Hints:
Shape of chain A: globular
Strand content of chain A: under 5%
Subcellular location (chain A): Mitochondrion matrix
Protein name (chain A): Lon protease homolog, mitochondrial
Oligomer: part of a larger assembly
Largest sheet of chain A: none
Organism (chain A): Homo sapiens
Number of helices of chain A: 3
Amino acid sequence: GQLGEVMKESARIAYTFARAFLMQHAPANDYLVTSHIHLHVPEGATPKDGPSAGCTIVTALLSLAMGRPVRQNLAMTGEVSLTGKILPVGGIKEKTI
Amino acid sequence: RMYDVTPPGVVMGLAWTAMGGSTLFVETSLRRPQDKDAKGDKDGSLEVTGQLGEVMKESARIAYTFARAFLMQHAPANDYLVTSHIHLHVPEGATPK
């Protein structure tokens, strides 16, 4: 999805956090570490806000892993830390409208 | 200070960034189940991340090898390092020098 390189680093971080969360939670499952996966982020975010999508990403992957749907109409945003801390994002008022 | 209790495998580290100085954390974690084979003999390859520069890549491998030696010199019964893959993440910010 016409990724910028900073998003590429963010993506790899979120990926590794997914891989860690699974074995820490439900070791018997192994979907992530044993399979290839395509992931698509639609373009549109301005570059400075780019990383902010990352908190969605990890929830995406986990949904695929167990295969259960996410709970409906639960929009989210954030920024993931490689150890589960989350960080402030900018421009909140536009997002909320 | 994002983490305060510092759960295993995360360490604080000072960094002389381009402006001022900041206490960026360093983090690591497993990337596969470790006991893939009780007889298994495969190098526990590392995977560095965080917009690494190549000089840092050489430094990282050096430090990795020193860890690998220190365990067997200290507590031989443990074999965690040589028998498992590991993701490691150094947050960006340090000036190259």
